[PDB]
Design an enzyme around this catalytic site. Structure first.
Site, PDB file in Angstrom:
ATOM      1  N   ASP A 194       2.372  15.022  14.886  1.00 33.91           N
ATOM      2  CA  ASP A 194       2.503  14.798  13.461  1.00 33.91           C
ATOM      3  C   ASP A 194       1.128  14.626  12.827  1.00 33.91           C
ATOM      4  O   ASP A 194       0.842  13.590  12.226  1.00 33.91           O
ATOM      5  CB  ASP A 194       3.369  13.566  13.188  1.00 33.91           C
ATOM      6  CG  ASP A 194       4.018  13.602  11.818  1.00 33.91           C
ATOM      7  OD1 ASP A 194       4.244  14.713  11.295  1.00 33.91           O
ATOM      8  OD2 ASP A 194       4.301  12.518  11.265  1.00 33.91           O
ATOM      9  N   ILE A 224       0.809  -1.221   0.000  1.00 35.26           N
ATOM     10  CA  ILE A 224       0.000   0.000   0.000  1.00 35.26           C
ATOM     11  C   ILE A 224       0.842   1.272   0.000  1.00 35.26           C
ATOM     12  O   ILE A 224       0.510   2.246  -0.675  1.00 35.26           O
ATOM     13  CB  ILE A 224      -0.896   0.093   1.248  1.00 35.26           C
ATOM     14  CG1 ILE A 224      -1.548  -1.245   1.563  1.00 35.26           C
ATOM     15  CG2 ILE A 224      -1.963   1.154   1.058  1.00 35.26           C
ATOM     16  CD1 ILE A 224      -2.366  -1.214   2.834  1.00 35.26           C
ATOM     17  N   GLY A 225       1.907   1.270   0.794  1.00 35.39           N
ATOM     18  CA  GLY A 225       2.813   2.399   0.862  1.00 35.39           C
ATOM     19  C   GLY A 225       4.226   1.965   1.198  1.00 35.39           C
ATOM     20  O   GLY A 225       4.425   1.205   2.146  1.00 35.39           O
ATOM     21  N   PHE A 227       9.236   5.201   7.181  1.00 30.75           N
ATOM     22  CA  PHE A 227       9.675   4.427   8.338  1.00 30.75           C
ATOM     23  C   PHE A 227       9.271   2.967   8.280  1.00 30.75           C
ATOM     24  O   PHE A 227       9.899   2.119   8.920  1.00 30.75           O
ATOM     25  CB  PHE A 227       9.157   5.070   9.628  1.00 30.75           C
ATOM     26  CG  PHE A 227       9.624   6.493   9.822  1.00 30.75           C
ATOM     27  CD1 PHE A 227      10.833   6.763  10.458  1.00 30.75           C
ATOM     28  CD2 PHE A 227       8.869   7.565   9.353  1.00 30.75           C
ATOM     29  CE1 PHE A 227      11.277   8.083  10.637  1.00 30.75           C
ATOM     30  CE2 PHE A 227       9.309   8.879   9.526  1.00 30.75           C
ATOM     31  CZ  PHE A 227      10.513   9.135  10.170  1.00 30.75           C
TER      32      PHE A 227
END
Length: 334
Positions: free
Chosen positions: A131, A16-17, A21
Site C-alpha cells: 500500500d 489530524i486525520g 481505519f
C-alpha cells in the site's frame, strides 16, 4: 474510560486525520514535552481485522529506519488500541508538495531516492508494503520522508499466499494483480506503486486516472499511459521498467537501487540500510531515566532492554530524538 491509562502519559491535541481505519490525534508526551501522533483504533469496530492489526504491529516493531515513521508506544485497552508514532509536520506527500504543478527531474530524484530507501529496507526485513500511496508518505521538519509502514488496505486472502488491495482509494497506485487479488511476490507489487509515484512526481497527474471506477480498473489492467513531452529518455525508460503489467517483468529492487536514473546526480546508489539502528543504549538517555526512576544504571538498562513499547520505550525514544535535534536530553519531571 479507556483513555484514563493513556491520559496519564499524554495530553491530546486537535485531530489530524479521521481516515478509514483509525482516528489519528496529534498529542504531547507529558514527560518530554515532545509532539507525537497517536493512532486510535476500536477493537469492537475492527472485529475480524484485529488479529491482522496485531501482526501488523508486530511487524512495525521490527522496523527502525531513517525513512520509516517510528513507533513509540503501543497501549491496549478493553475497547481501544493506541499506537503512538513519530509526528511528521511536513504532512502527506502533497501537503509537502506545496501544490506546485509538478516537480523537476532532480526534485523528484531527491524524494524518490528516499522512497526507494524506505521500501528496500522494508523488503530487507522480509515484508512488503503493498500500500504505497501519497498518504503513507509523510515529511518531517527536515523534509525527509517518513513512510507509514502500517496498514490494513492490502490483505492476504485465500488458501494460497495471495494478497488483495482492499482500499478503493489505493486503486490508482495498486498493481493490477494486487487489485485482482492474485498477488504473490508482493514486493513486485511495491515496485509498481513506486512507478506510479515516480510518474506523478514528474507529471503532476496519474498515469491511469478515471472518474469511473471500472474504467480506471481497466486502464490499469491494460497498462498504457501518456508520456509528457518534458520527460527525459532516462525518466521514460525507468518508468517502463517499473510500470510493467507483468509482475515478473518489473525491475528488481537490486537493479532499482543502482539504476542509472537513480545514480544520475549522486553517483552512488540508494542507501537503504538503517543508519540509526539500535546497537547500544545511549548513556545520556539512560542516566536521565534512572534519575526519574530513581534507580541504578544497570537496572535501568535491563529495564529499557525489555523494550516492550510501553511508556518507558516511548520516553527513551523521545529523549533519543531530543538529543538528535541537539536539544537537552531532559525530562519534564517536577
Amino acid at each position: 474510560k479507556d483513555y484514563d491509562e493513556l491520559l496519564k502519559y499524554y495530553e491530546l491535541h486537535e485531530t489530524i486525520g479521521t481516515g478509514g481505519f483509525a482516528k489519528v490525534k496529534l498529542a504531547c508526551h507529558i514527560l518530554t514535552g515532545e509532539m507525537v501522533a497517536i493512532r486510535i483504533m476500536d477493537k469492537n469496530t475492527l472485529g475480524s481485522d484485529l488479529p491482522r492489526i496485531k501482526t501488523e504491529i508486530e511487524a512495525l516493531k521490527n522496523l527502525r529506519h531513517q525513512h520509516i515513521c517510528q513507533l513509540y508506544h503501543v497501549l491496549e485497552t478493553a475497547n481501544k488500541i493506541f499506537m503512538v508514532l513519530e509526528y511528521c509536520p511536513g504532512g502527506e506527500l502533497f501537503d509537502y508538495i506545496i501544490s506546485q504543478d509538478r516537480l523537476s527531474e532532480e526534485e523528484t530524484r531527491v524524494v524518490f531516492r528516499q522512497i526507494v530507501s524506505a521500501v528496500a529496507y522494508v523488503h530487507s526485513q522480509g515484508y512488503a508494503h503493498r500500500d504505497l500511496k501519497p498518504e503513507n508518505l509523510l515529511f518531517d521538519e527536515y523534509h525527509k520522508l517518513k513512510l507509514i509502514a502500517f496498514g490494513l488496505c492490502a490483505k492476504p486472502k485465500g488458501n494460497k499466499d495471495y494478497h488483495l488491495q482492499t482500499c478503493c482509494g489505493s486503486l490508482a497506485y495498486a498493481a493490477p494483480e494486487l487489485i485482482q487479488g492474485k498477488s504473490y511476490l508482493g514486493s513486485e507489487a511495491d515496485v509498481w506503486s513506486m512507478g506510479i509515484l515516480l510518474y506523478v512526481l514528474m507529471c503532476g497527474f496519474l498515469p491511469f486516472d478515471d472518474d469511473n471506477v471500472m474504467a480506471l480498473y481497466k486502464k490499469i489492467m491494460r497498462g498504457k499511459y501518456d508520456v509528457p513531452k518534458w520527460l527525459s529518455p532516462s525518466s521514460i525508460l525507468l518508468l517502463q521498467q517499473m510500470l510493467q503489467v507483468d509482475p515478473k517483468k518489473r525491475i528488481s529492487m537490486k537493479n532499482l537501487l543502482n539504476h542509472p536514473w537513480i545514480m544520475q546526480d549522486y553517483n552512488y546508489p540508494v542507501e537503504w540500510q538503517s543508519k540509526n539502528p539500535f546497537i547500544h543504549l545511549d548513556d545520556d538517555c539512560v542516566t536521565e531515566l534512572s534519575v526519574h526512576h530513581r534507580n541504578n544504571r544497570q537496572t535501568m538498562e535491563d529495564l529499557i532492554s525489555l523494550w516492550q513499547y510501553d511508556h518507558l520505550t516511548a520516553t527513551y525514544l523521545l529523549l533519543l530524538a531530543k538529543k538528535a535535534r541537539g536539544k537537552p536530553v531532559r525530562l519534564r519531571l517536577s
